[PDB]
């Protein structure tokens, strides 16, 4: 499923540095993580 959609097989993408602009001499891993939202906000716990 990684190799059929024009994506690298090990998740070893080649990324570009947005801050410094120097080319990374190492392949990185990106993707999509489905995360959750919690009932641990600041507004219900803030005591003023």
């Amino acid at each position: 499923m990684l190799k059929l959609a024009d994506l690298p097989e090990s998740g070893q993408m080649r990324l570009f540095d947005g801050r410094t602009g120097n080319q990374f001499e190492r392949p990185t891993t990106v993707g999509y993580m489905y995360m959750l939202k919690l009932n641990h906000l600041v507004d219900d716990k803030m005591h003023a």
């Binding site: 990324l15 990185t28 891993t29 990106v30 993707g31 999509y32 993580m33 489905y34 995360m35 959750l36 939202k37 009932n39 906000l41 507004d43 219900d44 803030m46 003023a48």
Partner: protein, 242 residues
């Protein structure tokens, strides 16, 4: 088949196979509106069907909160990499991007409750009266002649919502208090104002107010507006099912 889809209620038709002789098409479904849960979070039902489609037994018509188009859909997804970036994800921390605040992806809306009572004391009774002392222009502009803020008004931090005036007798006032009362020329009001307000850090918009009165007691005009809105909504859904 589905005749008409509305966000308040949905109706479906009954086929000739799984039906009785009399009262063939009778199927109402009151969708849960924006009410209060137990942990002060909002709950609602969103329809995911169209007009002119057939359904089956046990089909999903309207999904609740954190459910979309028939399946459980709790959160959202975004592009995620594994990198310690500038100490923002220091040990196990998170570093977001401007897409989640610009597209309102992982934002959440809570429904905050505020229960105010209007009791009866031995020195003087209380009522929902809009004529409250120590009320400025910004507080009086939000509340009506009854004493309750209108449906859908912007509530800021430190706003008076409900109307509650309590009396007092033999307060033993200081000369400084009567001096500051006589300087401004205001009347010596012996009735205090114990109306509830919002806590610090809450600045939102109200959606509805629920009022309960005793049997054989005087009713507020805001209560009359609430019960007349509820009865015209009930008569509207009875008329549409008829």
């Amino acid at each position: 088949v589905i005749d008409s889809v509305d966000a308040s209620r949905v109706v479906v038709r009954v086929a000739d196979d799984e039906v009785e002789t009399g009262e063939a098409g009778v199927d109402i479904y009151n969708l849960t509106k924006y009410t209060r849960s137990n942990q002060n979070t909002c709950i609602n039902q969103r329809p995911l069907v169209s007009k002119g489609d057939v359904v089956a037994r046990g089909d999903i018509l309207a999904d609740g909160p954190s459910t979309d188009m028939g399946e459980l859909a709790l959160g959202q997804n975004m592009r995620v990499a594994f990198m310690p970036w500038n100490g923002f994800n220091f040990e196990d921390s998170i570093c977001l991007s401007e897409r989640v605040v610009q597209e309102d992806r992982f934002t959440t809306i809570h429904i905050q409750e505020l229960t105010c009572v209007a009791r009866d004391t031995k020195l003087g009774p209380e009522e929902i009266t809009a004529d409250i002392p120590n009320v400025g222009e910004a507080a009086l502009n939000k509340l009506d002649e009854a004493g309750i803020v209108y449906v859908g008004a912007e509530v800021q931090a430190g706003d008076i919502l409900v109307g509650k005036v309590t009396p007092k007798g033999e307060t033993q006032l200081t000369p400084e208090e009567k001096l500051l009362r006589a300087i401004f020329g205001e009347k010596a009001s012996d009735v205090k104002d114990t109306s509830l307000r919002v806590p610090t850090g809450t600045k939102g918009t109200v959606i509805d107010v629920q009022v309960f009165t005793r049997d054989g007691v005087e009713r507020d005009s805001r209560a009359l507006s609430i019960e007349k809105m509820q009865l015209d909504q009930i008569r509207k859904d009875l008329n549409e099912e008829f």
